[PDB]
Design a protein around this nucleic acid. Structure first.
Ligand SMILES: [Ca+2]
Ligand SMILES: [Ca+2]
Ligand SMILES: [Ca+2]
Ligand SMILES: [Ca+2]
Ligand SMILES: [Zn+2]
Ligand SMILES: [Zn+2]
Lengths: 351, 542, 542, 351
DNA sequence: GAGTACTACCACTGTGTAAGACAGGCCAGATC
DNA sequence: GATCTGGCCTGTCTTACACAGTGGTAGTACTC
DNA sequence: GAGTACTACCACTGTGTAAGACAGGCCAGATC
DNA sequence: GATCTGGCCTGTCTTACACAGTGGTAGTACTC
């Protein structure tokens, strides 16, 4: 639990508040960026190298059978874990394009080959969805669950634009929460099912959802109809029965009033929540350890590091987990002239 | 006594505050009064006939996802950006008119001129109220240094021509056509933002509604009470007031010293040194869409480079239909900065000394600028502007430069070059070439042919595999563009960029000054500044 | 029809360029014409009656080392600096009129009001053309941020009063006195420079002629054709529009937190904490001259410090006579920044905690500014300006601050303090105290006595050896100054600093823009801006 | 001959184009600062300390019997050399005040006592002049001569303001050359005599005058009437016969078209001329050795150091000799913002 | 016939940048 | 320990960005 | 009697500086 | 090797420096 300020040496114009960090095979990959892909990097995915307090970025390449891939802005991000057939993927759906559309396609992003000279190639299979498909949305969440012993993928939450009939050119950037249904995406085949829940009365967005071995705990979101931040916690339990996936749910008594968090994983099924925002003006400044078992979730305050004055007086902030209890955080920077390095960076670490 | 309209225009057109104008009004009113000027509050009431949001109109069929209110004025440009803190912030300050309302405003302002266009063509007016066709030039440009620059983007349009196709058996009787399409005084602002050109994220968030509405207007017909009668208009949009940088940014091309150079052709950069003149127009907005889908899905499983070349440089999703054309002004500036460099590299000799230093390049620039100061009386410029480019592409500046290059074939060569250039510049600078320089229009292919071939011959040391983009366009594409559309220079960005000059004046003397209001004020004052109706009060028979 | 003078003033007083005014002239002349406004060249011809260099005058006896030409206009201020490269460079850009010419201009402009003062006191007019006495307030200040600051100095004067002493058995019949002496519109510029206050080398090189002329005019009498008759004027100069930094710099004193604090007394800083109220005025320009003589020759051969003390802080040779007085406005700003600090050190506790940090001081500043924002709705300021200082020395801002100091003895103490201050502020802020607030003038000694003694008692923790200069002046010197010179606030430099605001305007919109000309233009427009004759055309019976 | 750029660490604002360097007892003293004397230094004279490529300034103090002393700007400066009674003085007359008056008084500036702790005290005796006094002037020159075996002091050249009767407030900063007389100042008593010379037809200013053992060689001046820079070197030869100091003069064939030079001494009677200006636009960039004997003056170009681009593209420049073949030169500096270090400094050295 | 007004002449700031594609150079560094 | 190679660098090339708009002067329309 | 005009209300940038005197702290450094 | 001292430093105090001037709103003079 120490934070040390890094400095990003060259290339800092290629990072924007909503971005994604993917931990693939020990190597960390930044995903999503400001702009369309420049031709310095016609793929749009970058490799992150931390060294000596420096953040360096390397241009990753694709394979020949891979589909190219727009830079989604706040997409939903699923660590598909190493199993049959091909480990060990990373589902992306669907986020927001660099031209502000909303994505209505699912991408499976895996590792493919190495080396030669510490070169890695990834690949993207655009996975086609037949349903009952979910609507284009963002800030929602995707998780993977195993039941006897088939594997499926649950998708819930998020914001979207108003329906195309009521969407107006004075409503155009207005958002509303999407209807509170859950989606079971099986990933081969591409069959989606939508399930409605008596307990899930209203949609939410920018929440964290943690799954383990067929139970999913949805922690504190942000509800936009009532602009309340519920502190309750939802636990839903699925089981994939031939061939209708029955799905039960419960409201648990107390969870956590956060939004837009950083969940670094440290243990087997144990994470640490680095904090987005508690109230509309006041960002959550304390760290929280969240272990979860089959009794349920357990939860303890750890004491946070000494936030610098700079990361304490910022208005907004964001970042994400380099994994294994380490994360990257970012602060907008104010200077005249513009630095033009737009964001100061810190590296946080557990123990 | 003066009409309140006239004095409104006096106050807008001479750059006066409310409090300055009032000081003068009370002053001229107590000496020799008899009131001459109107008071302020009756100009505030006088103008509401001229701002957008005053006349009643309606569309048939209704507009797709556009509201039916016809009386909306100045909105803020965020367009309902829900301002939660967890989403991307709503930092932008932007203001705008709702596109169609400002259209109907500009038409009701040209109602005098459409009516007298009707009477002058001896066309009847109770008949022919159904088939009018307006051609609208849209135009957008970023703008720096408005004291960080806190740059500004300023999306405007201009009503170019309005013709009539009713009732049948014909194709169109032009009724109005713009005599001075490159003036400020005919470039009407629609939307302002404090945004950088480059971050495609904010520009698309603010401009998303606008393009949605444009896309919504291409099907319906407008219905306006013009000349007592309800009449039907339809619209054709020609997006041409974009400098090239922006056309590439908004057509999914890569910018701007790429391997794909033309906006209109598929030729690579080195391939456009060999063949300088033989290229057909191929690119279209809807094919950029189809090729971007080639790029996303990759249906043949090719590598990065085989894909890039399969798709001829469409790696971004096109986001705005743009007319595939050229910009007269920026063509001028490119050719002038090219010729300035060629002279600089000919004073020092670089067809003998094939690789020169940077410091001899500086020596040669200094001697060129001294020479051009002694005769031709020019000063040096930080950056090429329009007046310098006009003065630089003269016979006698070349002639005063040729006195420094020693070999008189390089001399007679570049004199042949410049005079060729002058023999073909008016075809792309003309407001209408087919009427105002027709022989140059037909001699264009031959003239450009010899220009290309003289570059191939006597400058091969420079243009082996690299050409500037404008030179490419000017040598391979001009005849076909001007045959398809009718004119060049008529569609330039000049009027828009020229309007930025005005934008600067208003920001100083008419500021609120606050961000929440500064655009609502610049926007109102700029819109008055352009209405024809107040410009006729301005000329008043000269 | 309008008179050409009136419209000239319309064009100066509303800030219009020649080409803007012309656009409006031509516009209002082709709608509804009948010409209302005069054209430009007849205004260019109309003003030469109002600029300096038009009326004929003469001095008796002739002026010492001043030329006899009476028709000289705008000169450049270098005054013939031979521009050898081996001498100190002639880098300065400066412009100026010639002092006496602008004087005679300002009197021929007040011709109407001297004559009307003559008729209104029922004094005869063909008699009494010999005994006039004019009192002239001159005034100099530096000025920053005219986009390095490229600071500016702006030496101006104002005609304060004109009275009559002819023919004998009397002292003087005041005929005019300035009703609004602190306004801009009565502050006539005489000389402009692009100079810093601080470099005494350029300021003395440009201002050397000016002081020579002033010194040359105190002996002679002026002779002017005013009301048909030649009449004789005498002059008394009162140099009072100098802030304190400048007075010390210009009187050979050391600046400004010295050991010698007063400009008017010999008391040391520590000695002016023990005795706050008992000091007589001693310093004069000529005594500074003879003490500087003590300093340079050192006729008693004493050390550095013993000599400095022998001479009471005169280590530089005085170069300009200055009236030994104070500046009402800057006194306000000093006392306001003092009370702002005192509040800051009473919200936090200091007479308990005798040494605090800077970051506690910062906490206290933030809380004070928040408190003054909650009630009293003020924003915080970088620097103290006149409006803030005026609003800050109110009963109810103290009253809203006292809600944060806990002990109701400190509370009632500083309430007694502030109300004492308000009981004695009007004697030094008044344009004439002896007529407008006479009982405070009588009660001033007593009021200041108790103010000093309450500081002695309840603030000893702050004022043990350190006092601010204005507090010293306001506590020890006000009764004697206002008895000798009749008034305070009437002579401040506020009106001058207020005209710096105008200077800024003209630089932005009436510039050449070039240094060789920019001053000739600011200077012409500022001089027009002030002449009374165009201001009556401005009010015209309101 | 080497030049090495210095940097003046602190107190940059206390130096102005016309200033004087007095070499007293091995220590060098800067004299004539911008402004009146601040109270950082109520005397106005500074000690120069060169170390480590740094220029440091130290406040000198006076004695008790000393007269204080205005900061003259281009005064005439005479190294009185060590003899009877009190060595080894430095005559100053008269330069230009910080308030631009011209000085009509003569100051004798000597060393007085040391230490304690490398403390030196100077003294100024305001020397009273009885004559035939010279008029207040500046840019003129003063030299010391020995004849059988009495010591006198010759004063010649310079600019002044127009006479007080024709001085107008539009002529006020205009200067004219003062009449070309020479003044013999004996230093006790304060007896001044003026002598007119048939060969000295016009006054000159900003010239260098070099004396040795009752002969004085005036090198190239600037004449302001005819705006020429004469290259004719003047040589005048005095002899003090009581009671009339007879005084002869010759024009010598060729000297040197310089103005406002830096004459460092390196030898017994040998100097080096570091150059002011050749023509009104073009500063003299080459160095010149000037040895002088009793045959006359001899003169040879040495090759100059490689002037940096910075000291080559300045418009103006000035400086002075730190003595013993070493000198200090100064260049105005251009930047935005103002540095506010107004002048870049170099140290030049011979051999 | 000239004298008016209008409109077009001139002087002039300040004499660099800001991102990005691409060729080429080349080197860390890691494997072979 | 040799390669070599993927990646960092450096320079070069290309595409935009500021510079109008204001006083005075004077020819010149142009007209009482 | 109201309806006009005028004139005074409010929002608001931006929330630090730039030089200098003097007290005091103290330390190079050189002598004693 | 001890002093101490003259000189550098650091902080603190005091003196100036930017922030008007422009839209819109509305009470209010004030009057057809
Ligand atoms: Ca542009
Ligand atoms: Ca001031
Ligand atoms: Ca552009
Ligand atoms: Ca001041
Ligand atoms: Zn092409
Ligand atoms: Zn006093």
């Amino acid at each position: 639990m120490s934070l040390q300020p890094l400095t990003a040496v060259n290339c800092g114009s290629l990072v924007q508040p909503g971005f994604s960090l993917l931990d693939l095979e020990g190597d960390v990959y930044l995903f999503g960026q400001k702009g369309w892909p420049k031709r310095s990097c016609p793929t749009g995915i970058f490799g992150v190298r931390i060294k000596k307090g420096e953040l360096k970025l390397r241009a990753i390449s694709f394979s020949n059978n891979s589909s190219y891939l727009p830079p989604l802005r706040c997409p939903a991000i699923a660590h598909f874990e190493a199993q049959d057939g091909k480990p060990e993927c990373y589902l992306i759906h669907g986020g927001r394009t660099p031209n502000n559309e909303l994505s209505s396609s699912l991408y499976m992003l895996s590792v493919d080959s190495r080396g030669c000279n510490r070169k890695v190639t990834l690949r993207c299979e655009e996975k086609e969805l037949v349903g009952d498909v979910p609507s284009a949305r963002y800030g929602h969440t995707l998780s993977v669950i195993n039941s006897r012993g088939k594997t499926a993928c649950v998708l819930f939450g998020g914001r979207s634009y108003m329906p195309p009939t009521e969407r107006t050119t004075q409503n155009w950037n207005s958002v509303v929460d999407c209807p509170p249904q859950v989606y079971l995406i099986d990933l081969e085949f591409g069959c989606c099912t939508a399930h409605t829940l008596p307990e899930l009365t209203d949609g939410q967005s920018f929440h964290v959802a943690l799954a383990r071995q067929d139970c999913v705990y949805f922690l504190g979101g942000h509800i936009l109809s009532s602009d309340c931040r519920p502190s309750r916690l939802i636990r839903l339990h699925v089981e994939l029965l031939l061939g209708s996936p029955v799905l039960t749910c419960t409201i648990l008594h107390e969870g956590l009033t956060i939004t837009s968090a950083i969940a670094s994983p440290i243990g087997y099924h144990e994470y640490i929540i680095f904090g987005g925002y508690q109230s509309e003006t006041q960002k959550r400044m304390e760290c929280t350890y969240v272990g979860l078992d089959d009794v349920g979730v357990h939860m303890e305050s750890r004491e946070p590091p000494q936030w610098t004055s700079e990361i304490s007086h910022s208005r907004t902030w964001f970042g994400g987990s380099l994994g294994k209890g380490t994360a990257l955080v970012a602060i907008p920077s104010e200077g005249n002239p513009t630095p033009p390095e737009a964001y100061h960076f810190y590296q946080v670490s557990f123990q | 006594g003066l009409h309140p309209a006239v004095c409104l225009a006096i106050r807008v057109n001479t750059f006066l505050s409310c409090s300055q104008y009032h000081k003068m009004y009370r002053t001229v009113k107590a000496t020799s009064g008899r009131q001459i000027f109107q008071p302020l509050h009756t100009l505030r009431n006088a103008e509401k006939e001229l701002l957008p949001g005053f006349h009643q109109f309606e569309w048939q069929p209704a507009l797709k996802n556009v509201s039916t209110s016809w009386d909306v004025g100045i909105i803020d440009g965020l367009s309902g950006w829900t301002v939660s803190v967890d989403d991307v912030p709503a930092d932008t300050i932007s203001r705008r008119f709702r596109y169609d309302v400002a259209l109907v405003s500009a038409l009701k302002d040209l109602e005098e001129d459409i009516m007298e266009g009707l009477r002058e063509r001896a066309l009847d007016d109770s008949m022919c109220t159904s088939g009018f066709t307006v051609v609208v030039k849209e135009s957008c440009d970023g703008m720096g240094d408005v004291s960080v620059p806190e740059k500004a983007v300023r999306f405007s349009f201009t009503i170019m021509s309005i013709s009539i196709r009713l009732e049948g058996e014909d194709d169109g009787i032009t009724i109005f056509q713009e005599q001075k399409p490159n003036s400020e005084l005919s470039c009407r602002p629609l939307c302002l933002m404090f945004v950088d050109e480059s971050d495609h994220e904010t520009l698309t968030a603010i401009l998303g509604p606008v393009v949605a509405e444009r896309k919504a207007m291409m099907e319906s017909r407008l219905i306006i009470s013009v000349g007592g009668l309800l009449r039907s208009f339809r619209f054709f949009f020609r997006g041409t007031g974009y400098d090239e940088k922006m056309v590439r940014e908004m057509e999914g091309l890569e910018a701007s010293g790429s391997t794909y150079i033309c906006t209109l052709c598929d030729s690579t950069r080195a391939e456009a040194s060999q063949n300088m003149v033989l290229h057909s127009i191929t690119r279209s907005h809807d094919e950029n869409l189809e090729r971007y889908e080639i790029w996303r899905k990759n249906p043949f499983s090719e590598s990065a480079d085989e894909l890039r070349d399969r798709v001829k440089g469409v790696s971004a999703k096109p986001f705005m239909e743009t007319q595939p054309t050229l910009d007269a002004l920026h063509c001028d500036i490119g050719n002038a900065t090219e010729f300035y460099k060629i002279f600089q590299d000919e004073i020092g000799e670089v067809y003998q000394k094939p690789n020169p230093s940077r410091e001899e390049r500086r020596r040669w620039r200094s001697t060129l600028d001294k020479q051009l100061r002694k005769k031709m009386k020019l000063k040096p410029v930080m950056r090429m502007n329009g007046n310098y480019a006009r003065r630089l592409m003269t016979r006698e500046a070349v002639e005063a430069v040729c006195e420094l290059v020693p070999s008189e074939e390089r001399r007679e060569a570049l004199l042949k070059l410049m005079d060729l250039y002058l023999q073909m510049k008016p075809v792309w600078r003309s407001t209408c070439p087919s009427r105002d320089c027709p022989d140059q229009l037909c001699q264009y292919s031959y003239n450009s042919q010899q220009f290309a071939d003289l570059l191939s011959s006597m400058f091969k040391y420079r243009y082996d595999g690299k050409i500037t983009n404008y030179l490419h366009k000017t040598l391979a594409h001009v005849p076909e563009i001007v045959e398809r559309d009718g004119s060049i220079g008529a569609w330039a960005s000049e009027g828009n960029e020229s309007g930025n000059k005005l934008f600067r004046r208003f920001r100083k003397m008419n500021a609120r000054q606050s961000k929440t209001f500064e655009l609502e004020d610049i926007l109102k004052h700029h819109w008055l500044y352009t209405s024809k109706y107040l410009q006729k009060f301005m000329e008043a028979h000269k």
